[PDB]
Amino acid sequence: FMVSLPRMVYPQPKVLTPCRKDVLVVTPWLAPIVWEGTFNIDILNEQFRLQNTTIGLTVFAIKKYVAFLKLFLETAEKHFMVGHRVHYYVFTDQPAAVPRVTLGTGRQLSVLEVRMEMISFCERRFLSEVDYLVCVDVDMEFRDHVGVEILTPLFGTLHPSFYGSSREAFTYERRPQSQAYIPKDEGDFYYMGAFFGGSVQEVQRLTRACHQAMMVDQANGIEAVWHDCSHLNKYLLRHKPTKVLSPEYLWDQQLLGWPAVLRKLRFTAVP
C-alpha cells in the first residue's frame, strides 16, 4: 500500500515536448533509460521515502583493491542515495584495511570477510535488511548524484565503450559451447558488470543464474571471454531489465572524455 503524495509545485510536463531528443529514453520493452533531464528527482524521492526504502550497496575489495575503499565510500556519502537508508556491504580478505569512513545518519557499513556466488551465503541477510541491492566495482568514485531514479526490479548499465556500437561489435561471448553464447544477430545493449542491481529477489535470481551458467561452462572446460560480464549480458538479454542506466552512471573520463550527450558524469573510473 502506497500513501498519497503531498502537494508539490513543479513545471508541467509537456506532451508535445520531449525531455531529451538526442538519445533513446525508453527501450522497446518499455523500460526507461535513465538520463539527466528525464526525471524529477523530487517526485521520485517522495515516492521512495514514503516506502522507507533501504538500499544495499555491495563492493568487493580483495588484495590491493582495498586501497580504493576510502575514496569510494567518502564519495558515496556525498552522492549515493543521500536522504535514504543505505547499508554498505564490503566483502574483503582484509577486514583491518577497511578505512573508518564517517557516515551520515541512517547509513551503515558491514564488513564481510571472504562475486556471483557470494551475493546469491548472504541471501537471507539481504532479504531481511534491504529492499534493493546495488552491485558495483570498488575502483570507482561518485562525482554526481546517483539516487532513487535507478531503483526498479532489475537494472543494468550501458557499457561506456559500446553505447554507440552495432551489436555485432559487442564483445559478447561468441562460442556456441558457452552458456553465455549470444549470436551475432541478437542483443539489445552491451551492459557492463560494474554496476547492476534491482530488488533483492531479482538480484539473487540473476546471481544464482549466472553462477549456475559459470559452473556449467567450467564443467565443459570453457571460460567466457569477459567472465562475469558475458554471463550478465546473456541473462539481461533473456530477462529484460526494467530500467537501463545511461553511461552517466558508469564512465571513464580519462579514456572517453566528456561528450555533449553526457550532461552529468556520476560514477567514474579511478585512474
C-beta of residue 115 within 8 angstroms of C-beta of residue 203: no
After which residues do gaps appear in the chain, with C to N over 2.5 Å? 114, 120
Experimental approach was X-ray
Q: Which set of grid coordinates corresponds to residue 14? A: 509537456
Quoted resolution (Å): 1.6
- Which residue(s) pair with 197 in the sheet? 134, 155
User: Is residue 248 left, alpha or beta, with left meaning phi > 0 and alpha meaning psi from -120 to 50?
Assistant: alpha
Q: How far, in Å, CA of 79 to CA of 82, rounded?
A: 6
Q: Which set of grid coordinates corresponds to residue 30? A: 518499455
Name the CA dihedral angle for 25, 31, 32, 34, rounded to a multiple of 10 degrees.
-100
User: In this structure, which long-range contacts are made by residues 72-78, counting pairs with CB atoms below 8 Å and at least 24 apart in sequence?
Assistant: 72/138, 72/139, 72/140, 72/141, 72/142, 73/99, 73/101, 73/109, 74/101, 75/141, 75/142, 75/143, 76/142, 77/101, 77/102, 77/103, 77/104, 77/107, 78/142
The total domain count for the chain is 1
Q: How far, in Å, CA of 243 to CA of 155, rounded?
A: 5
| Domain range enclosing 138 | 1-271
167 phi and psi, to 5 degrees? -65, -30
Q: How far, in Å, CA of 105 to CA of 84, rounded?
A: 9
Q: Which set of grid coordinates corresponds to residue 256? A: 572517453
SS3 content of the chain, % helix, strand, coil (to 5): 30, 20, 50
CATH number, position 100: 3.90.550.10
The HSE-up count of residue 10 (CA atoms within 13 Å, CB side) is 11
**In the block, residue with C-alpha cell 521515502:** 49
Q: Which set of grid coordinates corresponds to residue 12? A: 508541467
**Taking the CB of residue 260, how many other CB atoms lie within 10 A of it?**
6
Find the helix or strand (DSSP H, E) in which 214 lies: helix 200-219
Angle between helices 228-238 and 200-219 (to 10 degrees): 120
